[PDB]
Design an enzyme around this catalytic site. Structure first.
Site, PDB file in Angstrom:
ATOM      1  N   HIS A   1      12.689 -27.733 -14.093  1.00  0.00           N
ATOM      2  CA  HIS A   1      12.837 -27.921 -15.555  1.00  0.00           C
ATOM      3  C   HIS A   1      12.018 -29.241 -16.046  1.00  0.00           C
ATOM      4  O   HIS A   1      12.477 -30.185 -16.202  1.00  0.00           O
ATOM      5  CB  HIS A   1      14.461 -28.510 -15.685  1.00  0.00           C
ATOM      6  CG  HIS A   1      15.402 -27.332 -15.773  1.00  0.00           C
ATOM      7  ND1 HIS A   1      16.533 -27.287 -16.006  1.00  0.00           N
ATOM      8  CD2 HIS A   1      14.960 -26.015 -15.498  1.00  0.00           C
ATOM      9  CE1 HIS A   1      17.229 -26.266 -16.061  1.00  0.00           C
ATOM     10  NE2 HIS A   1      16.582 -25.577 -15.889  1.00  0.00           N
TER      11      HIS A   1
ATOM     12  N   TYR B   1      18.408 -25.601  -8.018  1.00  0.00           N
ATOM     13  CA  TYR B   1      17.329 -24.679  -8.186  1.00  0.00           C
ATOM     14  C   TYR B   1      16.576 -24.356  -6.901  1.00  0.00           C
ATOM     15  O   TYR B   1      16.122 -23.155  -6.615  1.00  0.00           O
ATOM     16  CB  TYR B   1      16.425 -24.962  -9.252  1.00  0.00           C
ATOM     17  CG  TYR B   1      17.032 -24.888 -10.464  1.00  0.00           C
ATOM     18  CD1 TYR B   1      16.667 -23.536 -11.267  1.00  0.00           C
ATOM     19  CD2 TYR B   1      17.720 -25.840 -11.117  1.00  0.00           C
ATOM     20  CE1 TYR B   1      17.317 -23.253 -12.336  1.00  0.00           C
ATOM     21  CE2 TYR B   1      18.136 -25.844 -12.477  1.00  0.00           C
ATOM     22  CZ  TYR B   1      18.395 -24.623 -13.143  1.00  0.00           C
ATOM     23  OH  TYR B   1      18.760 -24.164 -14.333  1.00  0.00           O
TER      24      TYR B   1
ATOM     25  N   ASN C   1      14.021 -19.700 -10.277  1.00  0.00           N
ATOM     26  CA  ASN C   1      13.841 -18.593 -11.556  1.00  0.00           C
ATOM     27  C   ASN C   1      12.818 -17.519 -10.901  1.00  0.00           C
ATOM     28  O   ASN C   1      13.298 -16.263 -11.422  1.00  0.00           O
ATOM     29  CB  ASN C   1      13.480 -19.168 -12.886  1.00  0.00           C
ATOM     30  CG  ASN C   1      14.691 -20.009 -13.466  1.00  0.00           C
ATOM     31  OD1 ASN C   1      14.468 -20.532 -14.306  1.00  0.00           O
ATOM     32  ND2 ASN C   1      15.992 -19.614 -12.822  1.00  0.00           N
TER      33      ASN C   1
ATOM     34  N   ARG D   1      22.831 -30.615 -12.803  1.00  0.00           N
ATOM     35  CA  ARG D   1      24.032 -30.635 -13.620  1.00  0.00           C
ATOM     36  C   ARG D   1      24.978 -29.966 -12.708  1.00  0.00           C
ATOM     37  O   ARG D   1      26.202 -30.098 -13.440  1.00  0.00           O
ATOM     38  CB  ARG D   1      23.646 -30.126 -14.718  1.00  0.00           C
ATOM     39  CG  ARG D   1      23.172 -28.348 -14.713  1.00  0.00           C
ATOM     40  CD  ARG D   1      22.900 -27.936 -16.155  1.00  0.00           C
ATOM     41  NE  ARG D   1      23.000 -26.785 -16.269  1.00  0.00           N
ATOM     42  CZ  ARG D   1      22.031 -25.811 -15.910  1.00  0.00           C
ATOM     43  NH1 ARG D   1      20.853 -26.392 -15.624  1.00  0.00           N
ATOM     44  NH2 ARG D   1      22.001 -24.585 -16.051  1.00  0.00           N
TER      45      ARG D   1
HETATM   46  C1  LIG Z   1      11.873 -23.760 -15.606  1.00  0.00           C
HETATM   47  C2  LIG Z   1      11.716 -24.787 -16.154  1.00  0.00           C
HETATM   48  C3  LIG Z   1      12.269 -24.523 -17.719  1.00  0.00           C
HETATM   49  C4  LIG Z   1      12.785 -25.843 -18.366  1.00  0.00           C
HETATM   50  C5  LIG Z   1      14.197 -25.596 -18.760  1.00  0.00           C
HETATM   51  C6  LIG Z   1      14.272 -24.184 -19.480  1.00  0.00           C
HETATM   52  C7  LIG Z   1      15.560 -23.145 -19.463  1.00  0.00           C
HETATM   53  C8  LIG Z   1      16.130 -23.325 -18.057  1.00  0.00           C
HETATM   54  C9  LIG Z   1      17.240 -22.362 -17.858  1.00  0.00           C
HETATM   55  C10 LIG Z   1      18.469 -22.982 -17.459  1.00  0.00           C
HETATM   56  N1  LIG Z   1      19.724 -22.259 -17.649  1.00  0.00           N
HETATM   57  C11 LIG Z   1      20.287 -21.794 -18.570  1.00  0.00           C
HETATM   58  C12 LIG Z   1      19.945 -22.253 -20.078  1.00  0.00           C
HETATM   59  C13 LIG Z   1      20.688 -21.473 -21.442  1.00  0.00           C
HETATM   60  C14 LIG Z   1      20.531 -21.716 -22.844  1.00  0.00           C
HETATM   61  C15 LIG Z   1      19.269 -22.515 -23.123  1.00  0.00           C
HETATM   62  O1  LIG Z   1      18.468 -22.761 -24.632  1.00  0.00           O
HETATM   63  S1  LIG Z   1      19.542 -22.470 -25.701  1.00  0.00           S
HETATM   64  N2  LIG Z   1      18.743 -22.498 -27.149  1.00  0.00           N
HETATM   65  O2  LIG Z   1      20.289 -23.601 -25.824  1.00  0.00           O
HETATM   66  O3  LIG Z   1      20.392 -21.188 -25.829  1.00  0.00           O
HETATM   67  C16 LIG Z   1      18.192 -22.823 -22.109  1.00  0.00           C
HETATM   68  C17 LIG Z   1      18.687 -22.770 -20.461  1.00  0.00           C
HETATM   69  C18 LIG Z   1      21.782 -21.326 -18.245  1.00  0.00           C
HETATM   70  C19 LIG Z   1      21.791 -21.363 -16.840  1.00  0.00           C
HETATM   71  C20 LIG Z   1      22.664 -20.746 -16.194  1.00  0.00           C
HETATM   72  C21 LIG Z   1      22.715 -20.870 -14.829  1.00  0.00           C
HETATM   73  C22 LIG Z   1      21.549 -21.605 -14.252  1.00  0.00           C
HETATM   74  O4  LIG Z   1      21.449 -21.888 -12.563  1.00  0.00           O
HETATM   75  S2  LIG Z   1      22.059 -22.816 -11.831  1.00  0.00           S
HETATM   76  N3  LIG Z   1      21.507 -23.242 -10.599  1.00  0.00           N
HETATM   77  O5  LIG Z   1      23.340 -21.796 -11.054  1.00  0.00           O
HETATM   78  O6  LIG Z   1      22.521 -23.953 -12.465  1.00  0.00           O
HETATM   79  C23 LIG Z   1      20.470 -21.941 -14.893  1.00  0.00           C
HETATM   80  C24 LIG Z   1      20.608 -21.817 -16.258  1.00  0.00           C
END
Ligand SMILES: CCCCCCCCCCn1c(-c2ccc(OS(N)(=O)=O)cc2)cc2ccc(OS(N)(=O)=O)cc21
Ligand SMILES: O=C[C@H](O)[C@@H](O)[C@@H](O)CO
Ligand SMILES: O=C[C@H](O)[C@@H](O)[C@H](O)CO
Ligand SMILES: O=C[C@H](O)[C@@H](O)[C@H](O)CO
Length: 721
Positions: free
Chosen positions: A230, A239, A180, A293
């Site tokens: 995470h 990641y 990130n 995931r």
């Molecule tokens: C840094 C550690 C923090 C702990 C988790 C905090 C949120 C991490 C964000 C993960 N992440 C999200 C995501 C979407 C919504 C969230 O909260 S809520 N209330 O449900 O709306 C949290 C995280 C979407 C999304 C898409 C593609 C990604 O990328 S990928 N690699 O292609 O899958 C990663 C991704």
């Protein structure tokens, strides 16, 4: 205006699209160009072009779903790429130029601007969309005025004003690190160049540099090669991918700014490659146990995901020099050439990446030699990767402890990965497609290979958990021998088991003891659930006599061995039970859809044939013990089980050990501090994991205390008789 900022953006454009490298006579490049031509044509024929519309594209009309913003802007980025490609039918096309401009304006006025708030997923508002907007404006900067460029990027600053944090406009921001943090760079460094903002550029690069630090807790890279994200999830393969994929794209630009990164940290990148990434790549596949995931995504199976890492590596090699450059090129070359299943070019999405790959593959100066044997004990993320070059097979051990989460289920992805870290194992052999072609949506989630579980129903709405115990870990002796253990307790605390593994160069012993069950559900260990190939059918042997498997479960009491015979020895799998055991087997067609494990995936039905082998545990105090022997023919397997007749030293509630007489190696797991005499040759004295080798009258020792995450002085844990 033309200046050093635009100079950097020109470089960026050569990286994210690479139109300057296009060659119509280049087969692979023309293929990608054709793909982009088709995408733009599709977008142009379906775009809403009526008065005061409600959406640009119906497929992405509900702007409540944040994913629709990113998807919309990415369609505009595709148009920008082709309108600036001299060989495209859309080159400088008047309708395409006006569509992009008009579309940016519409989205700005009715969907994404500073007056808006995050609705849905923050990722789309702070990373997905801003990146698509940056690239679109960068590619088509000669069609937009600096004022318009600033206007369209103001929103980016509103949602992401701080280069050290994400979700800043919400009631729960977080510190940006790892992957990130790299995306933070693709967002603010580029927006900085577009807005000609020196402060944004410098402060963002400064923040990015955090990614080079070795950590001993939290998210990031550890000295043993582990990568956590995470909070506490093993994530090198997803990641980590973003981190190396995104950073490798930015570096060329960053090193030419007035804030270059000290060329001392590239050595740190080279370390990530060799210590963290390389071990997880087998025959062109990125081990799923490290992808979190993302295993539930149909367009991201192992071989596809692997390319994100490989392209990151070849870009890094291109910015390197001399030997370092050539060796990294050789690493990418040998991996790609060992992949007879997936065409690497299927995931190289820019002309420069295609070009780099082609020169590397055709350059005779770049060596392509089969990778040697290795064994990485990623204790900081509770995973273990093993590879035998002599016989050609990989092995992955997926665990978790009080220090790590077992599986990640978020954003409606990976709904059934419940047991993917409950001592699940992976075997990488001649069938490179095994974990691909619909494996994840068709595998029976209740019987993940190697796991001991009850048959209670599980809910898709469940989320990951950490293990009560810290007694989980691997003690590595050398490149071919190691021992691991997991003080297992199931999800609802109704079942326990002392699970251990003994990696002995060309085989792995699985030992389980102290199996107890306090529920009304039935308990059993899945010895294996192998996905089959209709082209290469297995001939099954039990106790060396052919057996006919059916969809209906058949019981085989008093089993000493099971052999799966293929026409290709590199696909053979044999199981040797130290003590005759009562197992059951079946071969059946299993159906499913990716949507079943991931809401945003296709509901189209998928199917695969699987061969399941399991052992029931009906009494408290039960145990299991067998040796997995891959890649040898039937006659050789039969010879080996004779040699291993007395290899099991012990398998009870306090001591588990296997001895390899041919190597002179012992694998030992002790659950208490009693004095254990082994083979009437030596004694081990402490709770922990051991891998010992005798050479002459000498003993090489490898001890590991998984709870304190420490080794120990030899005299504290070992004493020769
Ligand atoms: C840094 C550690 C923090 C702990 C988790 C905090 C949120 C991490 C964000 C993960 N992440 C999200 C995501 C979407 C919504 C969230 O909260 S809520 N209330 O449900 O709306 C949290 C995280 C979407 C999304 C898409 C593609 C990604 O990328 S990928 N690699 O292609 O899958 C990663 C991704
Ligand atoms: O093989 C010799 C032994 O390894 C011995 O030196 C140990 O007791 C540790 O010092
Ligand atoms: O000691 C470091 C740990 O092994 C680690 O996995 C953390 O718990 C991650 O949050
Ligand atoms: O590993 C489990 C975690 O401790 C968790 O419960 C926290 O909420 C942080 O993710």
């Amino acid at each position: 205006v033309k200046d050093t900022y635009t100079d950097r953006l020109d470089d960026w454009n050569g990286i994210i699209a690479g139109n300057q490298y296009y060659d119509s006579k280049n087969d692979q490049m023309a293929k990608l160009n054709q793909e982009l031509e088709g995408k733009v044509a599709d977008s142009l024929s379906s775009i809403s072009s009526q008065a005061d519309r409600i959406y640009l594209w119906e497929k992405f009309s509900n702007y409540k779903t944040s994913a629709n913003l990113t998807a919309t802007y990415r369609k505009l980025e595709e148009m920008a790429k082709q309108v600036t490609n001299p060989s495209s039918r859309y080159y400088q096309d008047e309708t395409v130029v006006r569509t992009v401009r008009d579309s940016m304006e519409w989205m700005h006025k009715h969907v994404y601007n500073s007056e808006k708030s995050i609705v849905g997923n923050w990722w789309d508002y702070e990373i997905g969309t801003p990146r698509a907007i940056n690239n679109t404006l960068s590619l088509m900067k000669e069609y937009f005025s600096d004022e318009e460029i600033k206007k369209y990027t103001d929103v980016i600053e509103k949602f992401v004003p701080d280069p050290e944090h994400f979700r800043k406009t919400t009631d729960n921001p977080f510190k940006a690190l790892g992957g990130n943090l790299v995306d933070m760079g693709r967002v603010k460094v580029i927006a900085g160049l577009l807005r000609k903002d020196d402060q944004e550029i410098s402060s963002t690069i400064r923040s990015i540099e955090q990614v080079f630090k070795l950590v001993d807790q939290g998210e990031g890279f550890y000295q043993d090669g582990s990568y956590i994200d995470h909070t506490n999830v093993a994530y090198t393969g997803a990641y980590g991918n973003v981190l190396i994929d995104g950073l490798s794209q930015l570096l060329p630009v960053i090193q030419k700014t007035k804030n270059p990164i000290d060329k001392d940290k590239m050595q740190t990148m080279y370390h990530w490659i060799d210590k963290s990434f390389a071990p997880l790549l087998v025959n062109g596949e990125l081990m799923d146990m490290s992808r979190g995931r993302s295993i539930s995504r149909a367009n991201s199976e192992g071989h596809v995901a692997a390319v994100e890492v490989l392209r990151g590596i070849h870009r890094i090699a291109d910015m390197s020099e001399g030997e370092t450059k050539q060796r990294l090129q050789s690493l990418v070359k040998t991996i790609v050439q060992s992949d007879s299943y997936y065409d690497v070019f299927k995931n190289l999405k820019t002309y420069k990446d295609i070009s780099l790959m082609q020169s590397l593959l055709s350059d005779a100066g770049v060596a392509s030699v089969p990778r040697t044997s290795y064994l990485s004990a990623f204790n900081k993320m509770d995973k273990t990767a093993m590879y035998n070059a002599e016989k050609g097979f990989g092995f992955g051990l997926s665990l978790f402890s009080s220090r790590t989460l077992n599986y990640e289920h978020m954003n409606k992805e990976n709904k059934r990965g419940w047991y993917t870290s409950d001592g699940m194992f992976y075997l990488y052999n001649g069938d490179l497609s095994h974990y691909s072609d619909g494996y994840w949506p068709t595998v029976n989630p209740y019987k993940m290979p190697g796991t001991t579980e009850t048959d209670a129903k599980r809910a898709d709405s469940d989320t990951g958990k950490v293990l009560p115990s810290a007694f989980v870990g691997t003690s590595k002796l050398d490149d071919a021998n190691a021992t691991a253990t997991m003080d297992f307790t199931n999800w609802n605390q109704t079942l326990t088991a002392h699970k251990s593994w003994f990696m002995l160069k060309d085989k792995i012993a699985f030992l389980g003891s102290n199996i107890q069950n306090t529920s009304t559900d039935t308990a059993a260990t899945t010895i294996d659930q192998r996905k089959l190939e209709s082209s290469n059918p297995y001939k099954v042997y039990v106790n060396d006599k052919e057996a006919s498997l059916t969809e209906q479960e058949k019981d085989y009491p008093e089993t000493q061995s099971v052999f799966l015979e293929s026409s290709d020895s590199k696909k053979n799998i044999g199981y040797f039970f130290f003590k005759k055991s009562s197992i059951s087997m079946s071969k059946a067609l299993q159906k499913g859809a990716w949507k079943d494990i991931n809401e945003g995936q296709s509901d189209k039905e998928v199917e695969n044939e699987f061969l399941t082998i399991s052992q029931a545990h009906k009494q408290n105090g039960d145990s299991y013990g067998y040796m997995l022997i891959p890649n040898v023919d039937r006659a050789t397997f039969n010879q080996m089980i004779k040699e291993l007749e007395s290899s099991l030293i012990e398998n009870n509630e306090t001591l588990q050990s296997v001895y390899d007489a041919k190597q002179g190696v012992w694998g030992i797991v002790k659950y208490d501090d009693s004095v254990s005499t082994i083979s009437n040759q030596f004694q081990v004295l402490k709770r922990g994991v051991y891998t010992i080798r005798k050479e002459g009258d000498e003993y090489k020792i490898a001890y590991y205390n998984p709870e304190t995450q420490e080794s120990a002085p030899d005299q504290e844990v070992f004493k020769k008789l």
